[PDB]
């Protein structure tokens, strides 16, 4: 009985919660009330199996058990159209179908929060319903959210209400908290989506190369054999979470945090503090801990990789143990390199041995490898330096606007909502990393730039619209940033004159947050470019500044919705002239 094992291993709470999460990630347009019943049924069942492994269907696989329950409510397509054919197939084809249908941008009501009183009352009335509704809303909206991490966020989301609702000034204790969570929740999600996309589009070898590089940078004192073992379990952990196997994903992540801690001294010295912490805090911690100190006396790489006369022999025997070895050794000595740079170096190195290990004499052509690593190394450093300086000058908001323009000219076919969401996120690179010494910059930035660009890749894949996007996205994971950076203004672009209907800001824009208000402005700016790309100098930066005044002004003219509309009527003409 697999459901019995898992239910035992995890405990009625986390079992029950990850079930809710798996269904919500599968049937996103499905009502909370419907999911609660299905989890209750799946649970009452699990229990019969814990009491008797030989009972009715206790020998069944989780996916089988799970889809029959989902299918009791999916084959009513007047509610969920497409999700009805998956229930016509059977395992393992049905799950494969379900996964294939996860939506990255569901067409769901923007979730808004009630006043603090509203929320704190509800919370006290029934914190379980209150907390179930949270897992659910976050789950259906982020279909690839690392299940285990979601249980952590839920722990913290609970302690905010428990604590802040007692407080004297609740609204003040609480508000900043929901904001940190909401923000770091999105970040976790973006990062997990990149791991799944590695696996699913590019393959397990791809993910492995990244985990090897990554961990090696984090545990430079660990041995290759050690690091390899961790990479093997890490991978398994994500495969499961990325394929819908969340109860098992969690169960194995729990075991890996344990192994890690148990072999603490052979892995890293910064771990001790994590290993004291409760289960969910320990795994999050370990997952995000800083890099250990590098070994005092480590040799020169060149000696075993490009000096030893047995490089080709050693390469050929087992190429994949050797190649990961190089990456390990190279990674651990350079925590100053973005992980995507490191992988670009291995890849070079590899194709370099393909060509040299067959030529007359190997020693003379690969003798130059680190020469070829050079330009690969400067380009990123020179881009971050260039994008960082601009940031200090413009400031976040205008740094994004500059990037909005830059990417909007690049990939003009892309949806505006998308160009806005991705560019705002790209613009947030300046604030996370420029505030680091020239050393820490590359890994913070480049890698971060990779988690965002994948966000674009997935959002555009849904409704493919621009070849170049698909090109840069599909061609190679490791080269996505360079691909997009090397792209230039699309001269193939066919503009859409000017819509009267979409440059009309309304008075209700004065009741929205200053964030949303910036999104309305930026949306229009994207639309400006989608009309006049040809000649867009500083003049654009100017045309935008009017609307800022236009909103600020008309938001306070004590008008009858007049000046807001009517100024727009005259100003839309002005902008057209530009």
Region of 412 on the Ramachandran plot (φ > 0 left; ψ -120 to 50 alpha; else beta): alpha
Q: Which of 246, 187, 66 is nearest to 431 (CA)?
A: 187
Distances, alpha carbon 394 to alpha carbons 239, 388, 548, in Å? 41, 10, 16
User: Is residue 22 within 8 Å of 140, Cβ to Cβ?
Assistant: no
Q: Which of 489, 473, 471, 484 is nearest to 383 (CA)?
A: 484
User: Is residue 445 within 8 Å of 429, Cβ to Cβ?
Assistant: yes
Tell me which DSSP letter residue 504 carries. Answer: -
User: Is residue 28 within 8 Å of 103, Cβ to Cβ?
Assistant: yes
Angle between helices 204-218 and 319-332 (to 10 degrees): 30
Q: How is residue 153 written in tokens? A: 């966020």
Other CB atoms closer than 10 Å to residue 347's CB: what's the count?
Answer: 17
User: Is residue 190 within 8 Å of 145, Cβ to Cβ?
Assistant: no
Angle between helices 2-10 and 12-26 (to 10 degrees): 120
Question: Which listed CATH number (3.30.460.80, 1.10.150.120, 3.40.50.300, 1.10.246.10) goes with 293-378?
Answer: 1.10.246.10
Tell whether 243 is in a known binding site: yes
* Topology given in CATH for the domain delimited by 104-193: Serum Albumin; Chain A, Domain 1 (1.10.246)
Residues 199, 205, 210, 211, CA torsion sign: positive
Q: Which of 186, 192, 106, 178 is nearest to 425 (CA)?
A: 186
Q: 156 Cβ partners below 8 Å, 6+ apart?
A: 181
Q: How far apart are CA 416 and CA 502, in angstroms?
A: 12
Q: How far apart are CA 182 and CA 156, in angstroms?
A: 11
Q: How far apart are CA 535 and CA 514, in angstroms?
A: 30
Distances, alpha carbon 156 to alpha carbons 11, 347, 566, in Å? 19, 41, 48
Give me the half-sphere count of Cα atoms (radius 13 Å) on the Cβ side of residue 106. Answer: 22
Tell whether 251 is in a known binding site: yes
Residue 354 burial class via C-beta count within 10 angstroms: exposed 0-12, middle 13-18, buried 19 and up: exposed
Which residue is associated with the tokens 């699990």?
Answer: 46
Q: How far apart are CA 431 and CA 388, in angstroms?
A: 9
User: Is residue 214 within 8 Å of 191, Cβ to Cβ?
Assistant: no
Phi, psi of 361 (to 5 degrees): -120, 125
Angle between helices 12-26 and 147-166 (to 10 degrees): 110
Q: How far apart are CA 225 and CA 366, in angstroms?
A: 27
SS (H, E, C) 360-415: CCCCCCHHHHHHHCHHHHHHHHHHHHHHHHHHHHHCHHHHHHHHHHHHHHHCCCCC
Helices (H), ranges, 428-511: 430-433, 441-462, 467-475, 480-486
Q: How far apart are CA 377 and CA 348, in angstroms?
A: 12
Q: Which of 294, 21, 14 is nearest to 145 (CA)?
A: 21
Q: How far apart are CA 103 and CA 27, in angstroms?
A: 9
Q: How far apart are CA 443 and CA 424, in angstroms?
A: 20
CATH class label, 201-292:
mainly alpha
Tell whether 240 is in a known binding site: yes
Q: How far apart are CA 445 and CA 443, in angstroms?
A: 6
470 alpha-carbon distance from chain centroid: 18
Asked: is 1-103 a CATH 1.10.246.10 domain? The reply is yes
Distances, alpha carbon 530 to alpha carbons 177, 294, 403, 471, in Å? 38, 50, 14, 21
Q: Which experimental method was this entry solved with?
A: X-ray
Other CB atoms closer than 10 Å to residue 31's CB: what's the count?
Answer: 12
Other CB atoms closer than 10 Å to residue 278's CB: what's the count?
Answer: 9
Q: How is residue 286 written in tokens? A: 């370990």
Residue 414 burial class via C-beta count within 10 angstroms: exposed 0-12, middle 13-18, buried 19 and up: buried
User: Is residue 257 within 8 Å of 233, Cβ to Cβ?
Assistant: no
Q: How is residue 289 written in tokens? A: 């801990």
Please report, in angstroms and rounded to a whole number, the separation of the first and last CA atoms in the chain. Answer: 70
Phi, psi of 398 (to 5 degrees): -70, -25
Phi, psi of 139 (to 5 degrees): -65, -45
Phi, psi of 76 (to 5 degrees): -135, 80
CATH of domain 379-490: 1.10.246.10
SS (H, E, C) 208-244: HHHHHHHHHHHCCCCCHHHHHHHHHHHHHHHHHHHHC
Tell whether 236 is in a known binding site: yes
Residue 519 burial class via C-beta count within 10 angstroms: exposed 0-12, middle 13-18, buried 19 and up: middle
User: Is residue 532 within 8 Å of 570, Cβ to Cβ?
Assistant: no
Tell me which DSSP letter residue 291 carries. Answer: P
Angle between helices 339-356 and 441-462 (to 10 degrees): 90
Other CB atoms closer than 10 Å to residue 564's CB: what's the count?
Answer: 22
Write out the DSSP string of 304-334: IIIISTTHHHHHHHTHHHHHHHHHHHHHHT-
Q: 56 Cβ partners below 8 Å, 6+ apart?
A: 48
90 alpha-carbon distance from chain centroid: 31
CATH of domain 491-568: 1.10.246.10
Q: How far apart are CA 71 and CA 348, in angstroms?
A: 48
518 alpha-carbon distance from chain centroid: 23
Distances, alpha carbon 173 to alpha carbons 133, 166, 465, in Å? 22, 10, 45
Tell me which DSSP letter residue 43 carries. Answer: H
Phi, psi of 343 (to 5 degrees): -65, -25
Which residue is associated with the tokens 């990554």?
Answer: 214
Task: Please report the resolution in angstroms.
Answer: 2.5
Tell whether 63 is in a known binding site: yes
Q: How is residue 284 written in tokens? A: 């999050």
Other CB atoms closer than 10 Å to residue 154's CB: what's the count?
Answer: 20
Q: 292 Cβ partners below 8 Å, 6+ apart?
A: 218, 219, 220, 221, 268, 269, 270
User: Is residue 158 within 8 Å of 131, Cβ to Cβ?
Assistant: yes
Per-residue burial over 472-484, b = 16 or more CB atoms within 10 Å of its CB, e = otherwise: bbeeebbbbbbbb
Q: How far apart are CA 15 and CA 44, in angstroms?
A: 12
Q: How far apart are CA 578 and CA 252, in angstroms?
A: 60
Tell whether 245 is in a known binding site: yes
User: Is residue 572 within 8 Å of 500, Cβ to Cβ?
Assistant: yes
Residues 424, 426, 427, 428, CA torsion sign: positive
Tell whether 255 is in a known binding site: yes
Distances, alpha carbon 9 to alpha carbons 3, 13, 55, in Å? 10, 11, 19
Q: Which residues in the chain are classed under CATH 1.10.246.10?
A: 1-103, 104-193, 201-292, 293-378, 379-490, 491-568
Percent helix, strand and coil across the chain, each to the nearest 5? 70, 0, 30
């Amino acid at each position: 009985s697999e459901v019995a094992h898992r239910f035992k291993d995890l405990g009625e709470e986390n079992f029950k919660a990850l079930v809710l999460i798996a269904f919500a990630q599968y049937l996103q347009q499905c009502p909370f009330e419907d999911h609660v019943k299905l989890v209750n049924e799946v649970t009452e069942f699990a229990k019969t199996c814990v009491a008797d492994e030989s009972a009715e269907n206790c020998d069944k696989s989780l996916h089988t058990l799970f889809g029959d329950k989902l299918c009791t409510v999916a084959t009513l397509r007047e509610t969920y159209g497409e999700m009805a054919d998956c229930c016509a197939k059977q395992e393992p084809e049905r799950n494969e179908c379900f996964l294939q249908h996860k939506d990255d941008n569901p067409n769901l009501p923007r979730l808004v929060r009630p006043e603090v009183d509203v929320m704190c009352t509800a919370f006290h009335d029934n914190e379980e319903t209150f907390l179930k509704k949270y897992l659910y809303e976050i789950a259906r909206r982020h279909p690839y959210f690392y299940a285990p991490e979601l249980l952590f966020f839920a722990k913290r989301y609970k302690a905010a209400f428990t604590e802040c609702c007692q407080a004297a000034d609740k609204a003040a204790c609480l508000l900043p908290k929901l904001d940190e969570l909401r923000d770091e929740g999105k970040a976790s999600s973006a990062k997990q989506r990149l791991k799944c996309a590695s696996l699913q589009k590019f393959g397990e070898r791809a993910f492995k190369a990244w985990a090897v590089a990554r961990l090696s940078q984090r545990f430079p004192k660990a041995e290759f054999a050690e690091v390899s073992k961790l990479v093997t379990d890490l991978t398994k952990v994500h495969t499961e979470c990325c394929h819908g196997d969340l109860l098992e994903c969690a169960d194995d992540r729990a075991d890996l945090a344990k192994y890690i801690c148990e072999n603490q001294d052979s892995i890293s010295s910064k771990l001790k503090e994590c290993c004291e912490k409760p289960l969910l805090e320990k795994s999050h911690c370990i997952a995000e801990v800083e890099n250990d100190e590098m070994p005092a006396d480590l040799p020169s790489l060149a000696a075993d990789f490009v000096e030893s006369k047995d490089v080709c022999k050693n390469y050929a025997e087992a190429k994949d143990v050797f190649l990961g070895m190089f990456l390990y050794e190279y990674a651990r000595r350079h925590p100053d390199y973005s992980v995507v740079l490191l992988l670009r170096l291995a890849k070079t190195y590899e194709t370099t041995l393909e060509k040299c290990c067959a030529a007359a004499d190997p020693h003379e052509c690969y003798a130059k490898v680190f020469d070829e690593f050079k330009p690969l190394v400067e380009e990123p450093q020179n881009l971050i330096k260039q994008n960082c300086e601009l940031f200090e000058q413009l400031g976040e908001y205008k740094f994004q606007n500059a990037l909005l323009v830059r990417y909007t000219k690049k990939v003009p076919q892309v949806s505006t909502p998308t160009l806005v969401e991705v560019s705002r996120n790209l613009g947030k690179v300046g604030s996370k990393c420029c505030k680091h010494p020239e050393a820490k910059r590359m890994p913070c930035a480049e890698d971060y730039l990779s988690v965002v660009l994948n966000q674009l890749c997935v959002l555009h894949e849904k409704t493919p619209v621009s070849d170049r996007v698909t090109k840069c996205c599909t061609e190679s994971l490791v080269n996505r940033r360079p691909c997009f950076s090397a792209l230039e203004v699309d001269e193939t672009y066919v503009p859409k004159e000017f819509n009267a209907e979409t440059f009309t800001f309304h008075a209700d824009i004065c009741t929205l947050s200053e964030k949303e208000r910036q999104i309305k402005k930026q949306t229009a700016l994207v639309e400006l470019v989608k009309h006049k790309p040809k000649a867009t100098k500083e003049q654009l930066k100017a045309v935008m500044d009017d609307f800022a005044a236009f909103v600020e002004k008309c938001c306070k003219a004590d008008d009858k919705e007049t000046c807001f509309a009517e100024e727009g009527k005259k100003l839309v003409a002005a902008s057209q002239a530009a």
